[PDB]
Design a protein around this motif. Structure first.
Motif, PDB file in Angstrom:
ATOM      1  N   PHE A  44      -5.095   8.112   1.913  1.00  0.00           N
ATOM      2  CA  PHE A  44      -4.949   6.867   2.459  1.00  0.00           C
ATOM      3  C   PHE A  44      -3.357   6.508   2.784  1.00  0.00           C
ATOM      4  O   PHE A  44      -3.279   5.653   3.841  1.00  0.00           O
ATOM      5  N   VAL A  69      -8.505   2.179   4.697  1.00  0.00           N
ATOM      6  CA  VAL A  69      -9.028   1.212   3.306  1.00  0.00           C
ATOM      7  C   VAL A  69     -10.422   0.494   3.792  1.00  0.00           C
ATOM      8  O   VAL A  69     -10.256  -0.640   3.997  1.00  0.00           O
ATOM      9  N   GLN A  74     -12.114  -0.097  -2.227  1.00  0.00           N
ATOM     10  CA  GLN A  74     -10.701   0.234  -1.966  1.00  0.00           C
ATOM     11  C   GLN A  74      -9.930  -0.802  -1.512  1.00  0.00           C
ATOM     12  O   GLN A  74      -8.832  -0.873  -1.883  1.00  0.00           O
ATOM     13  N   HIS A  77      -9.113  -2.632  -4.961  1.00  0.00           N
ATOM     14  CA  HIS A  77      -8.077  -1.952  -5.626  1.00  0.00           C
ATOM     15  C   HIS A  77      -6.475  -2.051  -4.933  1.00  0.00           C
ATOM     16  O   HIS A  77      -5.603  -1.967  -5.579  1.00  0.00           O
ATOM     17  N   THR A  78      -6.429  -2.071  -3.614  1.00  0.00           N
ATOM     18  CA  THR A  78      -5.256  -2.056  -2.948  1.00  0.00           C
ATOM     19  C   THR A  78      -4.677  -3.471  -3.185  1.00  0.00           C
ATOM     20  O   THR A  78      -3.425  -3.594  -3.597  1.00  0.00           O
ATOM     21  N   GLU A  81      -3.344  -3.521  -6.797  1.00  0.00           N
ATOM     22  CA  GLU A  81      -2.033  -2.631  -7.395  1.00  0.00           C
ATOM     23  C   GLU A  81      -0.772  -3.513  -6.899  1.00  0.00           C
ATOM     24  O   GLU A  81       0.239  -3.507  -7.767  1.00  0.00           O
ATOM     25  N   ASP A 156      -5.504   5.385 -14.617  1.00  0.00           N
ATOM     26  CA  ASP A 156      -4.947   6.619 -13.723  1.00  0.00           C
ATOM     27  C   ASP A 156      -4.067   7.462 -14.627  1.00  0.00           C
ATOM     28  O   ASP A 156      -3.178   8.330 -13.885  1.00  0.00           O
ATOM     29  N   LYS A 158      -2.208  10.354 -16.032  1.00  0.00           N
ATOM     30  CA  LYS A 158      -2.057  11.872 -15.498  1.00  0.00           C
ATOM     31  C   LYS A 158      -0.795  12.413 -15.608  1.00  0.00           C
ATOM     32  O   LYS A 158       0.156  11.605 -15.189  1.00  0.00           O
ATOM     33  N   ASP A 174       1.959   4.490  -9.819  1.00  0.00           N
ATOM     34  CA  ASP A 174       1.064   4.318  -9.025  1.00  0.00           C
ATOM     35  C   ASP A 174      -0.018   3.380  -9.995  1.00  0.00           C
ATOM     36  O   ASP A 174      -0.810   3.823 -10.816  1.00  0.00           O
ATOM     37  N   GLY A 176      -2.881   2.137  -8.295  1.00  0.00           N
ATOM     38  CA  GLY A 176      -3.954   1.836  -7.409  1.00  0.00           C
ATOM     39  C   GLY A 176      -5.109   1.809  -8.235  1.00  0.00           C
ATOM     40  O   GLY A 176      -6.133   1.044  -7.631  1.00  0.00           O
ATOM     41  N   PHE A 177      -5.433   1.953  -9.442  1.00  0.00           N
ATOM     42  CA  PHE A 177      -6.721   1.837 -10.185  1.00  0.00           C
ATOM     43  C   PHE A 177      -6.592   0.684 -11.423  1.00  0.00           C
ATOM     44  O   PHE A 177      -7.513   0.429 -12.057  1.00  0.00           O
TER      45      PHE A 177
HETATM   46  C1  LIG Z   1      -5.261   1.715  -4.125  1.00  0.00           C
HETATM   47  C2  LIG Z   1      -6.426   2.486  -4.330  1.00  0.00           C
HETATM   48  N1  LIG Z   1      -6.434   3.684  -3.333  1.00  0.00           N
HETATM   49  C3  LIG Z   1      -6.096   3.292  -2.113  1.00  0.00           C
HETATM   50  C4  LIG Z   1      -7.547   2.823  -1.515  1.00  0.00           C
HETATM   51  C5  LIG Z   1      -5.594   4.675  -3.816  1.00  0.00           C
HETATM   52  C6  LIG Z   1      -5.528   5.491  -5.329  1.00  0.00           C
HETATM   53  O1  LIG Z   1      -5.419   4.729  -6.423  1.00  0.00           O
HETATM   54  C7  LIG Z   1      -4.974   5.349  -7.518  1.00  0.00           C
HETATM   55  C8  LIG Z   1      -4.282   6.575  -7.053  1.00  0.00           C
HETATM   56  N2  LIG Z   1      -4.278   7.886  -7.510  1.00  0.00           N
HETATM   57  C9  LIG Z   1      -4.868   6.668  -5.417  1.00  0.00           C
HETATM   58  O2  LIG Z   1      -5.813   7.901  -5.100  1.00  0.00           O
END
Ligand SMILES: CCN(CC)C[C@@H]1OC[C@@H](N)[C@H]1O
Length: 340
Positions: A44, A69, A74, A77-78, A81, A156, A158, A174, A176-177
């Protein structure tokens, strides 16, 4: 818990809620920065080292292409974040300094952490000694205590998401999740090796999935490889749901006992999700040598300090093809990202 801990977390939630309900927006723009180097790339977008032209400060700028996105989840989640990251404050979370958008992209400008990803250091050495793994794990325990008390799930964890800073301490990146959740949530997300059984089985799940992922992380740090692995995800999933795990002989008995209780397939029996919450983890024998207040205050000497030459050194990150940041003449997906 002690009243000082309860009052600390009550104040933390007050301060989070004030920023949650009035998010910051539009606090810089692209031509305020010079581009230096691409630090990572994904489906992305990418992360780039940049330098602010007026102050000379370095930052890590994450760039997301709005046209990639596409799915409803998606977009959700954006927005999760950026709203969460601008509202949180804790010693082991990377800080968001600016955010903005243009015709083509969304931008999140973070503090730059030059020591690199834990993943790199772990693969170079092979495995961490138990005191070394325990130093990093204690920081994740305190960070999850903070996030869960705000009704947040991280989702997330890891080694690639744990950066090592100039003092040898962890900075988590990160979001994102990450999501604010009262009750349960249902989205399938996360890397296969770190997924809890209830995500794989499409159940409604809660903060217990973060404590499962801590079990996977501690095992991987102390063994050098994760407990469940295979070439195809479906094979990884079969191993995760089975309720079986083999431990190396060099693991201490206390480490094995903690991991059996974090890698508990029944979420109603898993450490972190019982009536005593995080304190079943903090009071376990494997953590008996941990000074929890000293870790939070960053007074403990770290296992190692990453080698780097200054705030703009990129030698602990790797090399990627350098591509344009194109910005179209026309706006894209304006309605979807109005709140960003
Ligand atoms: C914001 C969600 N997406 C973009 C749509 C990105 C994912 O979030 C977690 C991260 N490891 C990534 O791959």
């Amino acid at each position: 818990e002690q009243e000082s801990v309860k009052e600390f977390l009550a104040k933390a939630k007050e301060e989070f809620l004030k920023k949650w309900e009035s998010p910051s927006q539009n606090t810089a723009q692209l031509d305020h920065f010079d581009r230096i180097k691409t630090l990572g790339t994904g489906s992305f977008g990418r992360v780039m080292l940049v330098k602010h032209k007026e102050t000379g400060n370095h930052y890590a700028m994450k760039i997301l292409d709005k046209q990639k996105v596409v799915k409803l989840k998606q977009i959700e989640h954006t927005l999760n974040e950026k709203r969460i990251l601008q509202a949180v404050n804790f010693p082991f979370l990377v800080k968001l300094e600016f955010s903005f958008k243009d015709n083509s992209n969304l931008y999140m400008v973070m503090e730059y952490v030059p020591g690199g990803e834990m993943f790199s250091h772990l693969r170079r050495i092979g495995r961490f000694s138990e005191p070394h793994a325990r130093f990093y794990a204690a920081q994740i325990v305190l960070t999850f205590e903070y996030l869960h008390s705000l009704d947040l799930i991280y989702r997330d964890l890891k080694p690639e998401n744990l950066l090592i800073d100039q003092q040898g301490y962890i900075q988590v990146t990160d979001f994102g999740f990450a999501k604010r959740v009262k009750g349960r949530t249902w989205t399938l997300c996360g890397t296969p090796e770190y997924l809890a059984p209830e995500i794989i089985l499409s159940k409604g799940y809660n903060k217990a999935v973060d404590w499962w992922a801590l079990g996977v992380l501690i095992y991987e740090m102390a063994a050098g490889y994760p407990p469940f692995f295979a070439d195809q995800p479906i094979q990884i999933y079969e191993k995760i749901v089975s309720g079986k795990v083999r431990f190396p002989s060099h693991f201490s008995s206390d480490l094995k006992d903690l991991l059996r209780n974090l890698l508990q397939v029944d979420l109603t029996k898993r450490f972190g999700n019982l009536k005593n919450g995080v304190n079943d983890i903090k009071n376990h024998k494997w953590f008996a040598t941990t000074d929890w207040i000293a870790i939070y205050q960053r007074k403990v000497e770290a296992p190692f300090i990453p080698k780097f030459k200054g705030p703009g050194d990129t030698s602990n990150f790797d090399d990627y093809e350098e591509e344009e940041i194109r910005v179209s003449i026309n706006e894209k997906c304006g309605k979807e990202f109005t709140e960003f």
